[PDB]
Amino acid sequence: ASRILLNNGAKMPILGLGTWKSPPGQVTEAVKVAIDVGYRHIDCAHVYQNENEVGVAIQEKLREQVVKREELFIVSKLWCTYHEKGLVKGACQKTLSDLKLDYLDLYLIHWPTGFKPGKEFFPLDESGNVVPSDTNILDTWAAMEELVDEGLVKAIGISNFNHLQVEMILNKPGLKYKPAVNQIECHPYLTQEKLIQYCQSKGIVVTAYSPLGSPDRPWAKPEDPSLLEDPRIKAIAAKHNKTTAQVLIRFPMQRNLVVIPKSVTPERIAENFKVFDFELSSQDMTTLLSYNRNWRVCALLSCTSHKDYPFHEEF
Numbered sequence: 001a002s003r004i005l006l007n008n009g010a011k012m013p014i015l016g017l018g019t020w021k022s023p024p025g026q027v028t029e030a031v032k033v034a035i036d037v038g039y040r041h042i043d044c045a046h047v048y049q050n051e052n053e054v055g056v057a058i059q060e061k062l063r064e065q066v067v068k069r070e071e072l073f074i075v076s077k078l079w080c081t082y083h084e085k086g087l088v089k090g091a092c093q094k095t096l097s098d099l100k101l102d103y104l105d106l107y108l109i110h111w112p113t114g115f116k117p118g119k120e121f122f123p124l125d126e127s128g129n130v131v132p133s134d135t136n137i138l139d140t141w142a143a144m145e146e147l148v149d150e151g152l153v154k155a156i157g158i159s160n161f162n163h164l165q166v167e168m169i170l171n172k173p174g175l176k177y178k179p180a181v182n183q184i185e186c187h188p189y190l191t192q193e194k195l196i197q198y199c200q201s202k203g204i205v206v207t208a209y210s211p212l213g214s215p216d217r218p219w220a221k222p223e224d225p226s227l228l229e230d231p232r233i234k235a236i237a238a239k240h241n242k243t244t245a246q247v248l249i250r251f252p253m254q255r256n257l258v259v260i261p262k263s264v265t266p267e268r269i270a271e272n273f274k275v276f277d278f279e280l281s282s283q284d285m286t287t288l289l290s291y292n293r294n295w296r297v298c299a300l301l302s303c304t305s306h307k308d309y310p311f312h313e314e315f
Ligand SMILES: NC(=O)c1ccc[n+]([C@@H]2O[C@H](COP(=O)([O-])OP(=O)(O)OC[C@H]3O[C@@H](n4cnc5c(N)ncnc54)[C@H](OP(=O)(O)O)[C@@H]3O)[C@@H](O)[C@H]2O)c1
Pocket: 017, 018, 019, 020, 021, 043, 044, 110, 159, 160, 183, 184, 208, 209, 210, 211, 212, 213, 214, 215, 216, 217, 228, 243, 245, 246, 260, 261, 262, 263, 264, 265, 268, 269, 271, 272, 298
């Protein structure tokens, strides 16, 4: 199937286009190309500073009648400086206006860590620690629920929540809507088995981010492993007559995950979508899982003393 059923009763395309790092001068064409070659899910965020340009492409393909709005699944995320109850609707509405949408299919709490509101996305103290917000994830969640009840978003969810944090929301007193999605880092070097089964056992769909290991991440170092260049993965790809990226994308698909590879390269946007006509064997799957090294693209030293920092816990 190309879509997975969420606990809100809506269907979500299991392949989407990521947009973090997509330059504002190239992401309009990248999203236009993606829609033209079949993509119906775009992963966005205010903090990525390119929603206006992504929105230009969405609007143009709607206008061109390449796609209908109902056929699209647009996702964005509440940035950390907007966890306060009074700031959530505005933050959502700014994203909607930029994306030139009247609703989002899914809106996520981007990180469990709330930061001091202001112009700065990472407000810092003199020693470089991030300045927290005294807002907690359950009050932020109640504000997310209000967005559903106002018709601005069809589904709400979370991202980078560890299993204790997911658990806290599922056990929130008065919980009105369960999280539909937990969007987390996942690839053969960070296979996430425990957190994934926990979420799936609760009816929470997991989206895998950085599925290719985010080779363009701005903090990359030489010592770092490289999925795309791992000869063991290259060999599985060769066997299947596919590219390494195609294998890295099909892998989470077969674990019942949604996956959101990013590219601004038209040829790779198309390649990355051509993953619905081959199957990895159980053995291939277990082999790729065996490459786990608990290696994370996404974690910040500036946040490690925040009370809600998600990655001290095992999972
Ligand atoms: N929730 C959050 O905290 C969070 C965090 C990180 C990421 N995400 C989302 O997840 C998306 C995907 O993660 P990501 O951007 O970190 O990295 P990614 O998708 O793992 O990797 C993107 C890198 O791979 C390259 N690439 C793409 N397709 C390729 C192919 N077929 N062959 C060779 N190289 C290829 C891209 O190059 P070109 O673009 O130059 O083609 C780019 O440098 C993000 O864009 C964002 O939407 C969410």
